[PDB]
Amino acid sequence: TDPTLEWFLSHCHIHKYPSKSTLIHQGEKAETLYYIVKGSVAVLIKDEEGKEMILSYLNQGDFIGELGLFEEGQERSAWVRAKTACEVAEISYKKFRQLIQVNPDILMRLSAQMARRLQVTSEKVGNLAFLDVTGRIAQTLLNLAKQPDAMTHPDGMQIKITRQEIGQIVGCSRETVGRILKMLEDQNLISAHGKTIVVYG
């Protein structure tokens, strides 16, 4: 059982958010911490022209908006959009800091999540620096194929994903994803038809 989590949750005010709604806006003054009770969200950044890139998918049990907790006057570092319908707990940093005194184990949990996120984001940095847009998309297709939800196909592995989700992962437009996917098909690397993509061998 987890008494610490119930204790924490009891000090928050829980709300429901339909999918696609924005929970956090980049630039806002940060004064509250969030905790995903149910559902999943996408943490994303945009460029001066609206092109989006997902930094991470966050799910049940994950804290959100923790980056502004340690210093005053911080701004939210990214937008957070509900991927599915969510049930999110919210609490002011001020109240949260009071809880940390009563039981530091709650901070230990938050920090464990921050360390994992740093490891994963550093990994992305490596890829963005070493691969160009074509390689980024190819490697993404390979990783998707290696995932558990990836189905087995007569000629390799089959994955389901829209050209737009791929664009969000690599940080390019869906039209760009379209051109590269077309090129990859001509090189006999994949087979794209509808929302289904077959990765060969």
Place this chain on the structure above:
Amino acid sequence: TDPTLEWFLSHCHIHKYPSKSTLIHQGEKAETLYYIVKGSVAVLIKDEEGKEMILSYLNQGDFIGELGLFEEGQERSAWVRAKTACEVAEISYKKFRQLIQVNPDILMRLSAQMARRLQVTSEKVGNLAFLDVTGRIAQTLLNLAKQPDAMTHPDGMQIKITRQEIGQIVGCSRETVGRILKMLEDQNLISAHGKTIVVY
């Protein structure tokens, strides 16, 4: 410095490291936490080929090797090499977790640094994804103009970085860096005198 910091340091061993020496090797079993008492280090990762990429620079007052602390059986996520001569304090994770029980404020200081690192690293992800090699270099020069080792100037400030270094942060060749540094000079954005660049 303050009493809490000094309290933490009294439970550590302080070791000296010369320039270019490796403090942490990627893949090692993470069992120790470090604190930079004096000096500077670089955090590096690389691709299947051996090409190095500078993830970050850390300085006096920064903790290092904190990532493997929250879960046992983890490997160091990167290589950490001394940029200058360093004076680094170290303590076992086991002993550190004990200190947390006495005074959690020590964990707060650590977590604050991790939060900052996540912000900076995420920003780096944005730069690499949305900026062309030229855009990256212009930004990097500014990020470097913010370093503690940067010198002032009657026209902006100055850095003593090399073309290999810049290429390692941005993700490009020494040649390309030169090519781009040249352009930025024509456009009156910077001025290079040897290994010294004056960022306006």
